[PDB]
Ligand binder design. Structure first.
Ligand SMILES: CSC[C@H]1O[C@@H](n2cnc3c(N)ncnc32)[C@H](O)[C@@H]1O
Ligand SMILES: CSC[C@H]1O[C@@H](n2cnc3c(N)ncnc32)[C@H](O)[C@@H]1O
Lengths: 151, 151
């Protein structure tokens, strides 16, 4: 099972981007998303989609991201442009058996992300979006099969 | 060569999402992005990245999207949740030889998108983001090789 940890969410600014992270997480095979800043509006919007499109994905907001990431029972992945090439590490991760927590920020990433993560992982070495980084991470994790998943 | 056509851009609201579409386009192997609403700020931000990270990607804003899409010399792809499965059609598209224009909207898509497109293409049947839809479309088009591209 993969859980997404979305940090640097600003509820009075980032409704759309974080919504897109959550939709992406769900569609590409993650079981849950945890969001650092409490946002009831976001929760409502995503629960609306879960209701209408099905499946058992969950969203929590207002999380202590450092403690979640530090104490997660499984592999801690941090998506970052400065990390190791996804294609270099994805097979180890997948073949490990373990649950995975994948951290995506909004560009202003704290140092604790690098300090905690088991793997710091780049999806290309170019500046992209947390949304596209996550989509590619999950696609590679699931070897493209997440297209066969039914909700 | 692939060009991205981003429509439904609202300059006084959608700076971040559209920026992410543009970054994603560039990193995943598109040659250009055309944006419907004029946005000099966006152009400046993306030209900043092109300068600093290299390569020859281009951005134009203020485009007549219907006329661009209608008269594009090549295959017109519209990314939409209601389309044909990407995996069903991507090989035809790739093997055609032709340049490709890929249209991504912001959810409120006009009918002209369906009317013009050579292929209406779904990346999963679930609601996702234009950013993640595009990333997957380009990855599949390039068969994952866009990770070997140098800027
Ligand atoms: C607002 S974009 C910044 C965030 O997107 C993600 N990100 C951006 N570019 C990349 C990249 N090249 N590889 C992996 N993750 C990235 C990271 O999680 C970062 O915290
Ligand atoms: C604000 S999200 C709406 C836009 O994202 C893209 N999009 C969203 N969901 C999908 C999907 N499942 N497959 C393909 N494109 C999609 C389409 O281009 C749409 O115009």
């Amino acid at each position: 099972m993969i859980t997404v940890l979305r940090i640097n969410h600003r509820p009075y600014r980032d409704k759309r981007i974080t919504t897109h992270v959550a939709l992406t997480a769900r569609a590409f095979g993650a079981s849950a998303i945890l969001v650092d800043e409490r946002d009831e509006t976001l929760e409502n919007t995503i629960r609306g989609v879960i209701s209408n499109f099905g499946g058992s994905f969950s969203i929590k907001t207002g999380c202590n991201w450092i403690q979640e990431f530090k104490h997660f029972q499984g592999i801690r992945v941090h998506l970052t442009m400065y990390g190791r090439r996804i294609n270099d590490v994805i097979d180890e991760i997948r073949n490990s058996g373990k649950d995975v927590m994948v951290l995506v920020g909004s560009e202003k990433v704290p140092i604790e992300a690098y300090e905690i993560a088991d793997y710091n992982v780049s999806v290309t070495n170019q500046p992209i979006s947390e949304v596209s980084a996550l989509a590619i991470f999950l696609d590679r994790y699931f070897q493209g099969k997440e297209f066969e998943f039914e909700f």
